[PDB]
Amino acid sequence: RPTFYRQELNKTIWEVPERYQNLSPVGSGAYGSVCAAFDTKTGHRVAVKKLSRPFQSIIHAKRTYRELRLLKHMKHENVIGLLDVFTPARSLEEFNDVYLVTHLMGADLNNIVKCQKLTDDHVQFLIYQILRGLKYIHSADIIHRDLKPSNLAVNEDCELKILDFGLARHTDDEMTGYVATRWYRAPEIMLNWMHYNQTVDIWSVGCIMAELLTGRTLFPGTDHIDQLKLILRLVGTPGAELLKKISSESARNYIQSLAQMPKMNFANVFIGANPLAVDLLEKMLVLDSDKRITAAQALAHAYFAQYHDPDDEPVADPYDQSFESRDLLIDEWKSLTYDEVISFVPPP
Ligand SMILES: S=C(NCCc1ccccn1)N[C@@H]1C[C@H]2CC[C@@H]1C2
Ligand SMILES: [Cl-]
Ligand SMILES: [Cl-]
Ligand SMILES: [Cl-]
Ligand SMILES: [Cl-]
Ligand SMILES: [Cl-]
């Protein structure tokens, strides 16, 4: 067991191993506080995330377990990777606090795309890395669900990592009105049309790739309905085949109230873009999710000819998510989380 020291950082007590020095607050969502630090063991500038009220309810306790299981599994260049997890507790009986550690990232896609100049070569490399990471995530039957520019970390050399997996956190109010939180969402999940699957992430990659090419948001809707009208104007109103797959009758009833529109010409929307970029956007931005290109199929598209290497696009170990259908008490979720903290093995 390392030695721990205590310090108060913006109204909060932090108890961390001596290896972590020069702690300084970076911010706080509603589910945690984050400090920057120097790790004397690895020599990395690290990002440390402390959880707020991890075991306050059954919902919160299960979310804490879900986040720790997911972060312990992900071992890929283009996805967030765990360096450490710790608790100052010496037993299950006094266990209350969880701390998570990752290699530090100082900016998102918004920081590097708006406030710089992107060649087609930059767009190829950034979208290649997102799809390399997604092939790995999807091979473990994991769905991200919340891909958007603020959840993609990018460094000086244009190297990219996916972070902030959807842990089923987003509220009704967070998705309301003129908000970036909704602009990258597939229409089947925005309006609860049907049981969704991993194809929802490919829709989000299409919206991100269009925005890198034009410098503008693809579907900046003022509300759920305005956004659907923007989507259907580009990709066309649904045919009988997709309408049958919408399980919600009221959702089906509303779509059928809209005047029929054909799919637009993408060469006339994305004026001047590489024709191979236009062709890939047409294969991602398909209304019927059954017919979208997969991450594994997209990596072999001629747009990425420069970067594609089928011997260096790895898949994940199997990931058991049977806990998701399990009904347990707070103290049972807390015991499972404790076991995952003490069994952690750091990377080499
Ligand atoms: S290193 C980082 N997030 C990791 C958070 C985390 C998540 C899990 C465990 C530990 N730390 N985020 C950078 C700060 C903002 C600017 C670029 C991105 C967003
Ligand atoms: Cl230490
Ligand atoms: Cl990482
Ligand atoms: Cl504790
Ligand atoms: Cl964003
Ligand atoms: Cl597993």
Tab-separated table of C-alpha atoms and ligand atoms in Angstrom:
chain	number	residue	atom	x	y	z
A	1	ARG	CA	0.000	0.000	0.000
A	2	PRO	CA	1.507	3.420	-0.877
A	3	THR	CA	1.507	6.338	1.604
A	4	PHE	CA	-1.323	8.886	1.031
A	5	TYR	CA	-1.391	12.674	1.803
A	6	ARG	CA	-4.502	14.974	2.103
A	7	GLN	CA	-5.197	18.478	0.662
A	8	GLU	CA	-8.369	20.657	0.143
A	9	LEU	CA	-8.915	21.636	-3.582
A	10	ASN	CA	-11.947	23.986	-4.252
A	11	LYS	CA	-14.090	22.863	-1.233
A	12	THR	CA	-13.086	19.138	-1.695
A	13	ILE	CA	-10.671	16.851	0.330
A	14	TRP	CA	-8.237	14.887	-1.946
A	15	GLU	CA	-6.343	11.910	-0.444
A	16	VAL	CA	-3.843	10.542	-3.073
A	17	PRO	CA	-0.630	8.445	-3.195
A	18	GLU	CA	2.696	10.458	-2.833
A	19	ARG	CA	3.626	9.556	-6.487
A	20	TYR	CA	1.008	12.262	-7.615
A	21	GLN	CA	2.355	15.870	-7.185
A	22	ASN	CA	1.396	19.507	-8.107
A	23	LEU	CA	-2.413	18.836	-8.114
A	24	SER	CA	-4.388	21.735	-9.730
A	25	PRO	CA	-8.160	21.832	-10.429
A	26	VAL	CA	-9.157	21.624	-14.158
A	27	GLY	CA	-13.004	21.507	-13.678
A	28	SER	CA	-16.039	19.491	-12.414
A	29	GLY	CA	-19.144	17.960	-14.061
A	30	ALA	CA	-22.030	16.687	-11.826
A	31	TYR	CA	-20.501	13.108	-11.495
A	32	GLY	CA	-16.904	14.172	-10.434
A	33	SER	CA	-14.040	16.734	-9.987
A	34	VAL	CA	-10.809	16.595	-12.156
A	35	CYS	CA	-7.228	17.758	-11.190
A	36	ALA	CA	-4.015	17.849	-13.358
A	37	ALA	CA	-0.942	16.292	-11.676
A	38	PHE	CA	2.617	15.068	-12.347
A	39	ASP	CA	3.086	11.260	-11.910
A	40	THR	CA	6.618	10.687	-10.474
A	41	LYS	CA	6.395	6.901	-11.254
A	42	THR	CA	5.751	7.177	-15.084
A	43	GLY	CA	6.854	10.806	-15.685
A	44	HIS	CA	3.498	11.511	-17.498
A	45	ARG	CA	1.395	14.646	-16.934
A	46	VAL	CA	-1.781	12.714	-15.845
A	47	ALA	CA	-5.520	13.577	-15.622
A	48	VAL	CA	-7.030	12.334	-12.267
A	49	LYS	CA	-10.884	12.010	-11.993
A	50	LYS	CA	-12.435	11.732	-8.436
A	51	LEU	CA	-16.070	10.404	-8.293
A	52	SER	CA	-18.753	12.438	-6.386
A	53	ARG	CA	-21.158	10.364	-4.237
A	54	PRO	CA	-20.329	7.070	-6.063
A	55	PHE	CA	-22.647	4.821	-3.870
A	56	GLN	CA	-25.478	7.335	-2.966
A	57	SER	CA	-28.211	5.174	-4.756
A	58	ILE	CA	-28.622	1.829	-6.650
A	59	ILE	CA	-28.554	3.845	-9.956
A	60	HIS	CA	-25.304	5.706	-8.920
A	61	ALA	CA	-23.577	2.548	-7.477
A	62	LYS	CA	-24.298	0.547	-10.706
A	63	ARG	CA	-23.057	3.544	-12.864
A	64	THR	CA	-19.768	3.624	-10.789
A	65	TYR	CA	-19.267	-0.160	-11.470
A	66	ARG	CA	-20.146	0.322	-15.226
A	67	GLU	CA	-17.602	3.178	-15.636
A	68	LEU	CA	-14.769	1.202	-13.858
A	69	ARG	CA	-15.487	-2.070	-15.848
A	70	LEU	CA	-15.460	-0.134	-19.177
A	71	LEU	CA	-12.249	1.896	-18.468
A	72	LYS	CA	-10.393	-1.262	-17.201
A	73	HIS	CA	-11.241	-3.056	-20.541
A	74	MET	CA	-10.135	-0.446	-23.171
A	75	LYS	CA	-6.490	-1.047	-24.388
A	76	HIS	CA	-6.182	0.730	-27.823
A	77	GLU	CA	-4.057	3.702	-29.178
A	78	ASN	CA	-7.236	5.621	-30.274
A	79	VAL	CA	-9.275	5.120	-27.023
A	80	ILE	CA	-8.779	6.459	-23.423
A	81	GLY	CA	-6.492	4.071	-21.415
A	82	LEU	CA	-6.320	3.526	-17.595
A	83	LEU	CA	-2.911	4.085	-15.842
A	84	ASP	CA	-4.282	3.658	-12.234
A	85	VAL	CA	-7.372	3.416	-9.939
A	86	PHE	CA	-7.080	3.868	-6.115
A	87	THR	CA	-8.982	4.303	-2.825
A	88	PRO	CA	-7.474	5.475	0.500
A	89	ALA	CA	-9.721	2.825	2.250
A	90	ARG	CA	-7.821	-0.095	3.911
A	91	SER	CA	-10.987	-2.355	3.933
A	92	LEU	CA	-14.458	-2.836	2.307
A	93	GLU	CA	-15.949	-1.559	5.624
A	94	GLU	CA	-14.407	1.966	5.278
A	95	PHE	CA	-14.653	2.058	1.388
A	96	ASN	CA	-16.325	5.343	0.195
A	97	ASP	CA	-14.115	7.080	-2.447
A	98	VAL	CA	-12.927	6.080	-5.992
A	99	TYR	CA	-10.144	7.896	-8.006
A	100	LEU	CA	-9.335	7.189	-11.741
A	101	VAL	CA	-6.054	8.124	-13.592
A	102	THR	CA	-5.352	8.628	-17.341
A	103	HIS	CA	-2.557	10.112	-19.587
A	104	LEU	CA	-3.309	13.925	-19.831
A	105	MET	CA	-5.005	15.500	-22.933
A	106	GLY	CA	-5.110	19.351	-23.127
A	107	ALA	CA	-7.708	19.998	-25.927
A	108	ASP	CA	-10.655	18.585	-28.020
A	109	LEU	CA	-11.470	18.576	-31.796
A	110	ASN	CA	-13.297	21.994	-31.369
A	111	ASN	CA	-9.966	23.543	-30.115
A	112	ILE	CA	-7.477	22.317	-32.844
A	113	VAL	CA	-10.869	22.379	-35.843
A	114	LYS	CA	-12.429	25.924	-35.685
A	115	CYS	CA	-9.131	27.711	-34.722
A	116	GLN	CA	-6.780	26.219	-37.434
A	117	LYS	CA	-6.830	25.296	-41.215
A	118	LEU	CA	-7.694	21.638	-42.189
A	119	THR	CA	-6.473	20.107	-45.507
A	120	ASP	CA	-8.259	17.016	-46.960
A	121	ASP	CA	-5.127	15.131	-45.633
A	122	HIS	CA	-6.028	16.298	-42.040
A	123	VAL	CA	-9.666	15.117	-42.524
A	124	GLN	CA	-8.461	11.683	-43.841
A	125	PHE	CA	-6.138	11.165	-40.776
A	126	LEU	CA	-8.627	12.378	-38.075
A	127	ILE	CA	-11.602	10.306	-39.422
A	128	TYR	CA	-9.272	7.234	-39.971
A	129	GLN	CA	-8.324	7.254	-36.226
A	130	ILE	CA	-12.028	7.607	-35.073
A	131	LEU	CA	-12.988	4.551	-37.239
A	132	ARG	CA	-9.839	2.551	-36.048
A	133	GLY	CA	-11.005	3.162	-32.416
A	134	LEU	CA	-14.682	2.322	-33.293
A	135	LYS	CA	-13.726	-1.008	-34.985
A	136	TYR	CA	-12.083	-1.982	-31.612
A	137	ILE	CA	-15.034	-0.705	-29.405
A	138	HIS	CA	-17.731	-2.373	-31.626
A	139	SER	CA	-15.797	-5.744	-31.727
A	140	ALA	CA	-16.484	-5.962	-27.889
A	141	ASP	CA	-20.258	-5.198	-28.489
A	142	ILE	CA	-19.792	-1.763	-26.789
A	143	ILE	CA	-21.835	1.249	-28.131
A	144	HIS	CA	-20.286	4.722	-27.417
A	145	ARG	CA	-23.688	6.583	-27.976
A	146	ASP	CA	-22.227	10.136	-27.381
A	147	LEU	CA	-19.621	10.768	-30.158
A	148	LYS	CA	-19.230	14.561	-30.755
A	149	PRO	CA	-16.212	16.931	-31.131
A	150	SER	CA	-15.960	17.672	-27.320
A	151	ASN	CA	-15.475	13.834	-26.684
A	152	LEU	CA	-12.431	13.543	-29.064
A	153	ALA	CA	-8.967	14.570	-27.655
A	154	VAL	CA	-6.389	15.748	-30.308
A	155	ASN	CA	-2.669	16.772	-29.801
A	156	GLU	CA	-0.191	19.020	-31.778
A	157	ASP	CA	0.614	16.044	-34.163
A	158	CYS	CA	-3.148	15.433	-35.049
A	159	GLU	CA	-3.190	12.147	-32.990
A	160	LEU	CA	-6.724	11.383	-31.618
A	161	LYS	CA	-8.369	9.451	-28.724
A	162	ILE	CA	-12.091	8.718	-28.125
A	163	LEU	CA	-13.276	9.439	-24.521
A	164	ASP	CA	-16.401	10.062	-22.313
A	165	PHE	CA	-18.364	6.875	-23.222
A	166	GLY	CA	-22.171	7.187	-22.785
A	167	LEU	CA	-22.937	5.708	-19.298
A	168	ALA	CA	-26.731	6.466	-19.733
A	169	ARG	CA	-26.299	9.898	-17.996
A	170	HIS	CA	-28.022	12.494	-20.317
A	171	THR	CA	-31.333	14.084	-19.076
A	172	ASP	CA	-34.372	15.476	-21.053
A	173	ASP	CA	-33.357	19.142	-20.293
A	174	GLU	CA	-29.736	18.533	-21.528
A	175	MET	CA	-31.127	17.447	-24.994
A	176	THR	CA	-33.659	20.436	-25.310
A	177	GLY	CA	-33.367	23.343	-27.836
A	178	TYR	CA	-30.359	24.741	-29.814
A	179	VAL	CA	-27.706	22.406	-28.207
A	180	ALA	CA	-24.536	20.556	-29.464
A	181	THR	CA	-25.559	17.711	-27.066
A	182	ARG	CA	-28.237	16.619	-29.696
A	183	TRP	CA	-26.772	17.707	-33.140
A	184	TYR	CA	-24.629	14.489	-33.594
A	185	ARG	CA	-27.383	11.940	-32.550
A	186	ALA	CA	-28.881	9.376	-35.003
A	187	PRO	CA	-32.601	10.088	-35.658
A	188	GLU	CA	-33.698	6.581	-34.360
A	189	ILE	CA	-32.271	7.373	-30.830
A	190	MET	CA	-33.178	11.146	-30.810
A	191	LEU	CA	-36.915	10.196	-31.301
A	192	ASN	CA	-36.949	6.612	-29.741
A	193	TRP	CA	-38.104	4.936	-33.051
A	194	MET	CA	-36.812	1.400	-32.264
A	195	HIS	CA	-34.222	-0.692	-30.311
A	196	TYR	CA	-30.941	0.958	-31.452
A	197	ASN	CA	-27.517	-0.782	-31.888
A	198	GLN	CA	-23.851	0.129	-32.778
A	199	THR	CA	-24.844	1.788	-36.179
A	200	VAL	CA	-25.832	4.954	-34.141
A	201	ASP	CA	-22.062	5.715	-33.749
A	202	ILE	CA	-21.515	5.675	-37.619
A	203	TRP	CA	-24.265	8.424	-38.015
A	204	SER	CA	-22.257	10.563	-35.499
A	205	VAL	CA	-18.977	10.012	-37.470
A	206	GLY	CA	-20.810	11.263	-40.644
A	207	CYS	CA	-21.957	14.490	-38.842
A	208	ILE	CA	-18.339	15.072	-37.530
A	209	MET	CA	-16.689	14.411	-40.947
A	210	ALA	CA	-19.164	16.869	-42.755
A	211	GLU	CA	-18.314	19.583	-40.131
A	212	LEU	CA	-14.461	19.112	-40.613
A	213	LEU	CA	-15.012	19.505	-44.444
A	214	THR	CA	-17.324	22.655	-44.333
A	215	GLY	CA	-16.376	24.244	-40.943
A	216	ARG	CA	-20.207	24.293	-40.159
A	217	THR	CA	-22.527	22.028	-38.045
A	218	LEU	CA	-24.385	19.625	-40.413
A	219	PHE	CA	-27.782	19.527	-38.546
A	220	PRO	CA	-27.893	22.520	-36.085
A	221	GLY	CA	-31.572	22.100	-35.134
A	222	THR	CA	-33.372	24.554	-32.754
A	223	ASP	CA	-35.316	21.505	-31.254
A	224	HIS	CA	-35.915	17.733	-31.933
A	225	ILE	CA	-38.512	18.523	-34.738
A	226	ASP	CA	-36.496	21.261	-36.559
A	227	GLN	CA	-33.476	18.855	-36.503
A	228	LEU	CA	-35.551	15.969	-38.012
A	229	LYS	CA	-36.708	18.382	-40.876
A	230	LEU	CA	-33.010	19.318	-41.595
A	231	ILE	CA	-32.066	15.577	-41.643
A	232	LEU	CA	-34.960	14.484	-43.976
A	233	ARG	CA	-34.268	17.419	-46.409
A	234	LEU	CA	-30.696	16.013	-47.037
A	235	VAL	CA	-31.290	12.181	-46.926
A	236	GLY	CA	-34.985	12.052	-48.079
A	237	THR	CA	-38.238	10.954	-46.312
A	238	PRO	CA	-38.417	7.234	-45.333
A	239	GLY	CA	-39.763	4.480	-47.675
A	240	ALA	CA	-42.252	1.679	-46.652
A	241	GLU	CA	-39.352	-0.661	-45.705
A	242	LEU	CA	-37.982	1.693	-42.944
A	243	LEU	CA	-41.514	2.844	-41.754
A	244	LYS	CA	-42.323	-0.864	-40.914
A	245	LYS	CA	-39.174	-0.978	-38.624
A	246	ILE	CA	-40.406	2.014	-36.491
A	247	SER	CA	-42.061	0.119	-33.509
A	248	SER	CA	-43.603	3.356	-32.089
A	249	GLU	CA	-47.014	3.894	-33.819
A	250	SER	CA	-47.165	7.634	-32.851
A	251	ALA	CA	-43.603	8.168	-34.296
A	252	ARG	CA	-44.787	6.356	-37.536
A	253	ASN	CA	-47.997	8.457	-37.610
A	254	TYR	CA	-45.997	11.718	-37.291
A	255	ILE	CA	-43.418	10.828	-40.069
A	256	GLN	CA	-46.333	10.069	-42.503
A	257	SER	CA	-47.728	13.644	-41.943
A	258	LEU	CA	-44.652	15.107	-43.735
A	259	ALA	CA	-44.625	15.795	-47.537
A	260	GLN	CA	-42.343	13.251	-49.367
A	261	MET	CA	-38.833	14.584	-50.296
A	262	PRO	CA	-36.082	12.899	-52.375
A	263	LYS	CA	-32.403	12.464	-51.241
A	264	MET	CA	-30.281	15.535	-52.330
A	265	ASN	CA	-27.150	15.378	-54.529
A	266	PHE	CA	-24.175	15.336	-51.949
A	267	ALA	CA	-21.708	16.751	-54.657
A	268	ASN	CA	-23.941	19.927	-54.738
A	269	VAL	CA	-24.094	20.104	-50.828
A	270	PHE	CA	-20.290	19.515	-50.172
A	271	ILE	CA	-19.089	21.744	-53.095
A	272	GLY	CA	-15.376	21.240	-53.906
A	273	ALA	CA	-14.850	18.251	-51.530
A	274	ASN	CA	-12.774	15.188	-52.614
A	275	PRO	CA	-15.222	12.911	-54.522
A	276	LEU	CA	-14.096	9.930	-52.347
A	277	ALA	CA	-15.117	11.944	-49.151
A	278	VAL	CA	-18.528	12.667	-50.784
A	279	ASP	CA	-18.957	8.904	-51.572
A	280	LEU	CA	-18.097	7.871	-47.935
A	281	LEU	CA	-20.556	10.477	-46.457
A	282	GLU	CA	-23.341	9.015	-48.698
A	283	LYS	CA	-22.592	5.517	-47.119
A	284	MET	CA	-22.585	6.750	-43.429
A	285	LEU	CA	-25.567	9.189	-43.608
A	286	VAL	CA	-28.258	6.567	-44.493
A	287	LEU	CA	-31.613	6.860	-42.674
A	288	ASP	CA	-32.099	3.015	-42.382
A	289	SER	CA	-29.455	1.966	-39.789
A	290	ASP	CA	-29.405	-1.678	-41.235
A	291	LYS	CA	-27.903	-0.160	-44.492
A	292	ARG	CA	-25.141	2.098	-43.025
A	293	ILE	CA	-21.435	1.194	-43.670
A	294	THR	CA	-19.722	-0.448	-40.580
A	295	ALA	CA	-16.394	0.775	-39.048
A	296	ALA	CA	-14.579	-2.361	-40.411
A	297	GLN	CA	-16.054	-1.749	-43.946
A	298	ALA	CA	-15.212	2.043	-43.834
A	299	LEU	CA	-11.466	1.443	-42.960
A	300	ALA	CA	-11.166	-0.388	-46.396
A	301	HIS	CA	-12.782	2.558	-48.368
A	302	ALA	CA	-10.431	4.239	-50.965
A	303	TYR	CA	-10.667	7.592	-49.062
A	304	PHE	CA	-8.211	6.097	-46.395
A	305	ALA	CA	-5.797	4.389	-48.978
A	306	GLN	CA	-2.872	6.462	-47.464
A	307	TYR	CA	-3.433	5.134	-43.870
A	308	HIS	CA	-5.255	1.729	-44.128
A	309	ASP	CA	-3.215	-1.266	-42.793
A	310	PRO	CA	-5.335	-4.413	-42.177
A	311	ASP	CA	-2.446	-5.896	-40.027
A	312	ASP	CA	-2.557	-2.832	-37.647
A	313	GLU	CA	-6.339	-2.372	-36.976
A	314	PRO	CA	-6.798	-4.600	-33.905
A	315	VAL	CA	-9.996	-6.030	-32.274
A	316	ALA	CA	-10.806	-6.202	-28.519
A	317	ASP	CA	-10.898	-9.132	-26.074
A	318	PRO	CA	-14.462	-10.319	-25.315
A	319	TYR	CA	-16.336	-8.023	-22.833
A	320	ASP	CA	-18.955	-9.641	-20.476
A	321	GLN	CA	-21.833	-7.118	-19.862
A	322	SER	CA	-24.214	-9.647	-18.186
A	323	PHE	CA	-24.157	-7.379	-15.034
A	324	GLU	CA	-26.351	-4.888	-17.018
A	325	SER	CA	-29.445	-7.191	-16.633
A	326	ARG	CA	-28.673	-7.995	-12.945
A	327	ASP	CA	-30.735	-6.652	-9.972
A	328	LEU	CA	-28.476	-6.025	-6.868
A	329	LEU	CA	-28.525	-3.934	-3.611
A	330	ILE	CA	-26.240	-0.830	-3.118
A	331	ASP	CA	-23.810	-2.793	-0.913
A	332	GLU	CA	-23.524	-5.641	-3.547
A	333	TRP	CA	-22.589	-3.127	-6.378
A	334	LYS	CA	-20.167	-1.458	-3.893
A	335	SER	CA	-18.522	-4.863	-3.070
A	336	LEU	CA	-18.148	-5.665	-6.872
A	337	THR	CA	-16.513	-2.185	-7.428
A	338	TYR	CA	-14.094	-2.749	-4.440
A	339	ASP	CA	-12.952	-6.079	-5.988
A	340	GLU	CA	-12.268	-4.320	-9.385
A	341	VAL	CA	-10.189	-1.535	-7.561
A	342	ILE	CA	-7.957	-4.103	-5.722
A	343	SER	CA	-7.431	-6.428	-8.776
A	344	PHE	CA	-6.264	-3.550	-11.089
A	345	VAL	CA	-2.944	-4.330	-12.887
A	346	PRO	CA	-1.202	-1.244	-14.394
A	347	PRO	CA	0.032	-1.259	-18.029
A	348	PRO	CA	3.805	-1.876	-18.652
B	1	LIG	S1	-7.689	13.834	-20.244
B	1	LIG	C1	-9.355	14.242	-20.380
B	1	LIG	N1	-10.385	13.444	-19.966
B	1	LIG	C2	-10.184	12.240	-19.271
B	1	LIG	C3	-11.118	12.410	-18.112
B	1	LIG	C4	-11.017	11.176	-17.309
B	1	LIG	C5	-11.930	10.191	-17.556
B	1	LIG	C6	-11.806	9.009	-16.895
B	1	LIG	C7	-10.762	8.839	-15.993
B	1	LIG	C8	-9.885	9.883	-15.788
B	1	LIG	N2	-9.990	11.072	-16.428
B	1	LIG	N3	-9.891	15.361	-20.958
B	1	LIG	C9	-9.379	16.504	-21.562
B	1	LIG	C10	-9.853	17.772	-20.796
B	1	LIG	C11	-10.854	18.421	-21.769
B	1	LIG	C12	-10.029	18.994	-22.922
B	1	LIG	C13	-9.620	17.752	-23.730
B	1	LIG	C14	-10.165	16.590	-22.911
B	1	LIG	C15	-11.526	17.205	-22.460
B	2	CL	CL	3.278	6.705	-3.880
B	3	CL	CL	-4.927	6.719	-22.763
B	4	CL	CL	-12.543	5.718	0.988
B	5	CL	CL	-19.339	18.984	-29.089
B	6	CL	CL	-15.176	-9.422	-19.556
